[PDB]
Design a protein around this nucleic acid. Structure first.
Ligand SMILES: [Fe+3]
Length: 202
DNA sequence: AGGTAAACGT
DNA sequence: AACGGTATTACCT
């Protein structure tokens, strides 16, 4: 048990990974990866894009979900069926049979790239979990608690691993340590992560 | 009266 | 290099 409400499902997406990676390439050929700039003016080391009906984005004013890619001025690409199917099966296996994501943020890590501890809290309906799928190079995941200083668990996430948090762990701090260089036959020299969220409704 | 943004030194 | 300060404020609404 990763924490109350939280599971790691090791190698859960390993058989779906080839198709997932083809579809990430397709998503990116419409809304390219870009390193976004925080409100305070720093360029993130992780490159990002989104698919689905809502996409996570930084603004001068803060963070937000938008139906429009602000770089292309066009809707984000539709969420691929391969993504939505894997998400629905991982959710179900982790105990969240009703999750309906309408947003998928896609992170790409080059060697050196990191994601500092943060909370996912931009979603209006905190009852829905987050589903996180890992592809390519391995990375160390930090998973804390409700307070930034709460002790961290560190876990290696390998190609195909899926983590799901929700309920009591929904607002826990988490992040990614600087990516080590290396080789993966499917991604060559990077790691991808797909994070599914329910970002609309109410 | 409340909610947000946060990505250098030891 | 793991931990924790910083937002301990200054803006919105
Ligand atoms: Fe996150």
């Amino acid at each position: 048990p990763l924490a109350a409400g939280a599971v790691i499902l090791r190698r859960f997406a390993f058989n779906a990974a080839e198709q997932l990676i083809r579809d990430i390439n397709d998503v990116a050929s419409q809304s390219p990866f870009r390193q976004m700039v925080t409100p305070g003016g720093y360029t993130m080391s992780v490159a990002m894009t989104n698919c689905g009906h809502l996409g996570w984005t930084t603004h001068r004013q803060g963070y937000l979900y938008s139906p429009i890619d602000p770089q292309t001025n066009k809707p984000w690409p539709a969420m691929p069926q391969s993504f939505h199917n894997l998400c629905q099966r991982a959710a179900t296996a982790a105990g969240y049979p009703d999750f309906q994501p309408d947003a998928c943020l896609i992170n790409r890590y080059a060697p050196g790239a990191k994601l500092c501890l943060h909370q996912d809290k931009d979603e209006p309906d905190l009852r829905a979990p987050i589903v996180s799928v890992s592809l390519g190079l391995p990375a160390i995941f930090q998973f804390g608690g409700l307070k930034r200083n709460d002790p961290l668990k560190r876990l290696l996430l390998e190609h195909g691993d899926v983590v799901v948090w929700g309920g009591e762990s929904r607002l826990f701090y988490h992040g990614i340590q600087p990516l080590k260089a290396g080789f993966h036959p499917l991604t060559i020299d990077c790691r991808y992560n797909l994070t599914f969220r329910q970002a609309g409704k109410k």
